[PDB]
C-alpha cells in the first residue's frame, strides 16, 4: 500500500494497484534502471502451458470489469478458452474482450501521458485479414477515421495474432505517417535521420524516392509471414499542418510542416496471452513531440540553429540560452499552426495538467496508476508543468503494449 | 556488466562499478520507485556491531585508492580501528581519511550534476568543534573561503559525528544562506514559501526579521545535542547577485537578486559506518536552480506571471506558451547577472555537457558512474541538453550523503 506525493501540492495518492501487477521491470533492490530507454523486460515466442493462467487472469479483471465476476458466463468463458487451449494450443478473444484488451494496454501504459483519453479508444478488428492489401485497406480506413479531418479521434486497428511466429503481421514502419530520410554526398541528411535505415529499405525494395524534406513515405506491409510490400497512403488521406508563426513572417520561410496524425505501428499488444504483432494505434500530438524532439534534437531535423539564426540570436556563447530561446518559438509556432487549421493538437501545460487529473480517478476508483516519470515529464519546461512535482510508482500491468524488434532483423526472407 | 547508451550519439559505456553497491533503492523486480523524491533508503541509529565491517570496508578503499592496498600500514589500520571500535564502540578517521571520504561521498552523489569537481574539495576538518560560537566561527571561514569573492570553491566543513544520538551537532538551515519567508494576511507569502515554517522557528528562538523579500535567514545552530543559537552571518560575507537582463531594462524594477553560494547545510555525511550530522557543503549555483526552480516553482518565488505581464504576453490561454517564453528569459538574466558580476556561475548546457564528460571518465578509469535521470535533467529545456539522451545507472554507493529529519522534529528540547 504504498504512497506517492505531488511536491507542489501535498496532495498524498496511495496505489495499491501495483499489487496486481506481474511482469518485471529491469530494477532489483541495488540497482534502478529507470533511464534505459529499451528494457530486456518492455521486448518481445510463447507456448501453451503458460498461456491458460494468462488467458484466467485477463478473463477475471474482464469480467470483473462487466460487474458480473465468478458468474456462469465468466466459468463458461473459463472453461471454453480452457477447452480451446487445448485443443489449438492458442485461443481468439469475443470482438467485447479485444476492445477491452486493447483499452486497457494502453490505459497501463506507463509512458504515456495521453492516458486521460483511455476509455474512449476505438477499436478496429483487422482479425480476418490475410494480404497485405487488405493490411492497407484496413490501415487506410484507419487513417482516414482516427484523422477525421482535423478533429482527430484515437483508434487501434488488430491485424491477427502471431501464431507459430513464421507467419506474423507485421507493418514494418515505426508510424503509419513518417517523413523520409536521406543521407547526402557530404553524409548530411536530408528529411528525417531517424528513418533513413527505413527509407534504403524502402528503396531496397522498390520505392522511388522523392529525394526532398517531407516525403511521406510508403507503408511496407508483411502478411502473415510474407515478404512485405510497398504501398502508398492516398496523399488526401495524410492531413499536414504547415508551421507558421504568429509573430514572425520568416517562419514560413523555414518551410517546415508536420503531420497531425501520430500512429505507431511497431509495437506489438499483448491480451491474456496472446501476441498482436501488428496493431497500429493513433491519437494526436502533443506539441513538443514534434516541436522539441522531431524539429530540434540533434539526430533529427536540428532547426534550433537555422530558427536563432533568423531570430538574430547570441549563438557564441552557450549560456545565452539561444537554444533554449528558439526552442519555446518554435513550439508556439506547431501549437498555433495546428491550431489555425482545427487540427487537434495538445500543449504540454494543458497535456500534463490532464495527466495529473487522471492520475487521480485511477487512484480513486482503480488503486493506482502505472507512471514513467522518465517519460512523462514533457522535453521542455519540465518543472513548470505539474507532473515534475508527481512522485510516480512505475510498474507493468497487463494487457500491455511491449516494443519488438524490427522485422527486417529477424524476418526469414524468401 | 551492464550496458548504457546515449541515444543522441550511439556510445556504450559499459558499468561494472554497480557490483561494489551495497546500500538499497527503493525499487524492486516488479517496482520502479525512481520518482520518489525521499526514498525511505535516502534517509538516517547504529550499533558497534556492524560498525567494523563498514570501517573495513572504507579502509580498503582508501588503500586501495593511494596504491597501497593490503600493505602492512593498510593491515595495521585495520587492526587499530578494530582495536579502537572494541574498545569504545566507535572510532575516528585520520585527516585523510575524512577528505577522502567526503570527496567520495561527493563523487557518489547520483543526483549531483556538478560531479565532474569531485575531487577539487576543500574539506575543512571541524571535528574539534564543542559550542555553537565555534560552529558559527567554521560556518563563517567557509563562507568566506568558498565564496572568495565570487570566484566560487567547492568546499565541506565537517563537524563532529554522532556518538550516542543525542549529543549531536546540526545546523538547523536546510543551506546557511536562504531567504525568509514570511505568510501574510491574506495569506499569501512574502520572501521564500520554502522557509516559512523555519523563518518563524527563527523567530520563535529570538529573531528579529526584516520582514521583507530577501532578508538573509540567521543562522540556528545545535551542538553536541544542546539547543541551538542564533547568529547572523556578517552580511559582508553574504555575497549576492542583483538580478537584470541584458536587453529587458524593466528587470531591474522586477527588483530580484540572488546569493552566490549554495550551501547545503542539513544532509548527513556516511563515512566507513560513522555518522557527520552536520556537514554543511558548497560549490557554485547552476543557472535554473535559481531561474527555473528558486523563481519560477509555484510554491517558491513565483515570478513567471510578472515577468510575462511585463512581456506583454498572450497571458490568456495556456497553449501561448507565455510561461515558457517568460522562463528562458528569467535564466538568461540570472546567467548573465551573475556572469557580470564574476561570480561562478555554469548554465545548464555547459553543466550538462561535462557530466557526460564525467561520466566517461567513471566508467574507463572507475567502471561506472551511478546517476539519476530524474535529477540529472535540468528542469528546462530537457531534451536539447545531452543528459536527456544518455541512460543512467542509478546505485547507492558509500562513502555517501543522505537526507536526515528536520532537528525540530526529533530534538529532545530544554
Ligand atoms: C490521445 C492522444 C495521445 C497523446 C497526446 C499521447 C502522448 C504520448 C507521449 C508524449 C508519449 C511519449 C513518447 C515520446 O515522447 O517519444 C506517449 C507514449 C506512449 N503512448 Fe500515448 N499518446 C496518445 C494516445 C495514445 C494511444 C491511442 C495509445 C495506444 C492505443 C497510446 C499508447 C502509448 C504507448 C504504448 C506509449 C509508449 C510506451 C513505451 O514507450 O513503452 N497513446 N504518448
Ligand atoms: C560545484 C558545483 C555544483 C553544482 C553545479 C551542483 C549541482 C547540483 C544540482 C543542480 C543538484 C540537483 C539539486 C536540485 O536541483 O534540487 C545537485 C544535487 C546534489 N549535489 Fe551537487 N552541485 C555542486 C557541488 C556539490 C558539492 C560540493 C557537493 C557535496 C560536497 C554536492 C553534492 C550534492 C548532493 C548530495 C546532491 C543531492 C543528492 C540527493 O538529493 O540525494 N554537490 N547538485
Ligand atoms: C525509439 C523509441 N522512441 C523514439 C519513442 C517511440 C515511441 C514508441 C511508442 F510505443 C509510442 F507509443 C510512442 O508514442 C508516440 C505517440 C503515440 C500516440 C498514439 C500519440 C502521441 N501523441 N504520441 C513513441
Ligand atoms: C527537498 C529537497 N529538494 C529541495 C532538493 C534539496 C537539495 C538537497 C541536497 F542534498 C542537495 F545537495 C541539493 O543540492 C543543491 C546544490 C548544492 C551545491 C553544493 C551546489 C549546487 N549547485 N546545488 C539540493
Ligand atoms: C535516456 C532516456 O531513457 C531517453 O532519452 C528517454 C528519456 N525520456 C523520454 N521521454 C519521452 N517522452 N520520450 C523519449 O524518447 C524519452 N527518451
Ligand atoms: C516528483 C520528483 O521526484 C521531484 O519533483 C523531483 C524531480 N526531479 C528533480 N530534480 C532536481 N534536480 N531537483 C528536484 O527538486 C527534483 N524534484
Ligand atoms: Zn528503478
Redesign the interface.
Known sequence: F?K??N??TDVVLTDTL?LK?????????????????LPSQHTRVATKDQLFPLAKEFLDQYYSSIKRFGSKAHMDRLEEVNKEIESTSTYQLKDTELIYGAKHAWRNASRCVGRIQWSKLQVFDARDCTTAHGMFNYICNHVKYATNKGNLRSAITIFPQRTDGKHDFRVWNSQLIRYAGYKQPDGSTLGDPANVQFTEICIQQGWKAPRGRFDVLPLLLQANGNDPELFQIPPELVLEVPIRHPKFDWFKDLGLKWYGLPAVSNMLLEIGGLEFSACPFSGWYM?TEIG??DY????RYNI?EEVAKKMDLDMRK????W???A??EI??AV?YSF?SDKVTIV?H??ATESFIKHMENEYRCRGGCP????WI????????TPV?H???????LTPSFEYQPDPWNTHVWK
Open positions: 504504498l506517492v506525493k511536491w507542489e501495483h501487477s506481474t511482469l518485471e521491470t529491469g530494477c532489483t533492490e541495488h540497482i534502478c534502471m529507470g533511464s534505459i530507454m506539441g522539441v524532439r530540434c534534437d540533434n539526430s534550433l552557450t549560456s545565452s540560452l537554444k533554449d530561446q526552442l519555446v513550439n508556439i501549437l491550431q500543449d501545460h494543458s507512471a514513467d516519470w522518465v515529464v514533457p522535453p521542455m519546461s519540465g518543472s513548470i515534475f508527481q512522485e510516480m510508482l512505475n510498474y507493468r
